[PDB]
Amino acid sequence: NNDNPLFKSAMVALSLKISIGNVVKTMQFEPSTMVYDACRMIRERIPEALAGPPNDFGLFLSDDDPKKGIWLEAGKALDYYMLRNGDTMEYRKKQRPLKIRMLDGTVKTIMVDDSKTVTDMLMTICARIGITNHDEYSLVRELLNWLDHGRTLREQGVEEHETLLLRRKFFYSDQNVDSRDPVQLNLLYVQARDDILNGSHPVSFDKACEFAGFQCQIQFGPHNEQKHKAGFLDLKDFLPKAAVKQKGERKIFQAHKNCGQMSEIEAKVRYVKLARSLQTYGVSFFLVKEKMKGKNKLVPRLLGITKECVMRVDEKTKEVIQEWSLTNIKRWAASPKSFTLDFGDYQDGYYSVQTTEGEQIAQLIAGYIDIILKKKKSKD
Numbered sequence: 001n002n003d004n005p006l007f008k009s010a011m012v013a014l015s016l017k018i019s020i021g022n023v024v025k026t027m028q029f030e031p032s033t034m035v036y037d038a039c040r041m042i043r044e045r046i047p048e049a050l051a052g053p054p055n056d057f058g059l060f061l062s063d064d065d066p067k068k069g070i071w072l073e074a075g076k077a078l079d080y081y082m083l084r085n086g087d088t089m090e091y092r093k094k095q096r097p098l099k100i101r102m103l104d105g106t107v108k109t110i111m112v113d114d115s116k117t118v119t120d121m122l123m124t125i126c127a128r129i130g131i132t133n134h135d136e137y138s139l140v141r142e143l144l145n146w147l148d149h150g151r152t153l154r155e156q157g158v159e160e161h162e163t164l165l166l167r168r169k170f171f172y173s174d175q176n177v178d179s180r181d182p183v184q185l186n187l188l189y190v191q192a193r194d195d196i197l198n199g200s201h202p203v204s205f206d207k208a209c210e211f212a213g214f215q216c217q218i219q220f221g222p223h224n225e226q227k228h229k230a231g232f233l234d235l236k237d238f239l240p241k242a243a244v245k246q247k248g249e250r251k252i253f254q255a256h257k258n259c260g261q262m263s264e265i266e267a268k269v270r271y272v273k274l275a276r277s278l279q280t281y282g283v284s285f286f287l288v289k290e291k292m293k294g295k296n297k298l299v300p301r302l303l304g305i306t307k308e309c310v311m312r313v314d315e316k317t318k319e320v321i322q323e324w325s326l327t328n329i330k331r332w333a334a335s336p337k338s339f340t341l342d343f344g345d346y347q348d349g350y351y352s353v354q355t356t357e358g359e360q361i362a363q364l365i366a367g368y369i370d371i372i373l374k375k376k377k378s379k380d
Helices: 035-045 118-129 182-198 205-220 247-257 264-277 358-377
Strands: 014-020 023-029 057-061 088-093 095-101 107-113 137-141 163-168 284-290 299-305 309-313 320-325 331-334 338-342 351-354
Touching: 023 035, 035 057, 035 088, 095 118, 107 118, 118 137, 118 163, 163 182, 182 205, 182 264, 205 247, 205 264, 284 358, 299 358, 331 358, 338 358
Parallel strands: 014 088, 095 163
Antiparallel strands: 014 023, 057 088, 095 107, 137 163, 284 299, 284 351, 299 309, 309 320, 331 338, 338 351
């Protein structure tokens, strides 16, 4: 027998455990409290919440599956988040370290906001490195597994120990090549070289050996028959996977010889101009399976996307069977198994093919459209 002089009924307040590091205090909020207000009361009742400027801190609901933890939006109210008495929010630092592979082999570490999408972080990353054309850029895990620009790193399963790659994804505008800025020249070189080498830029066997000849001149200096003889080369470092044939060593060394005493800068300039001169340059290819009239077996075929068109290309000859301008495409739709283009009245029938790349294809087509729309308003 003992009543409680402190008993208060009809209290309709969220009783939440606030977590900051080793510390866990319990605090009371009115459910309709804006999140930016909850952070404010946290800062006024727990001194460990003053360890950094407010803009660096947020409320975070954790989860056994890290991809499912969420940062609460400043503009919402606690009850939007179906909070029940006894739940924990962490008042948590928003900045995480992120490792991007640098051109000199080092890895720069950039602080990025764990609460923002990959689109937003790309501005941060390019500014900290000094890239101007950031809407042409994207990220891949070091390990063409492009990440999703409309989702955070956390919700795609990218862990903080992972090192990421900054690569050019869209080919909308090309600055001129200038031997007077060797740093910029080396960028354009490294970008064209990696695309040839990894197979993003398909090239003939003959051409793949000509690039390799330039790459030899750039990495070893003028050809030296004494040191650059049979067996010298690690072909996987100099040829696309498709191109690796020991017939190539002799062919690469010839091209290397034909450079004579070309300087490393002239070789880089000649490498970039050659790549830019191929009709494959700036085209993203995807492997799809078409259906022919009659033929119940599907034909493998390449789908090429550019800043101007979508293209049906032959898997071997690389010649363009058919090309549709992006302005002739009314809508598209992807599935985990298919990709489909609607052309409106420009054609009788949809274009539909099997591919595991439907979503990647759609993201490329939509990204080019978004660059085009952004460039049309900014020229008005």
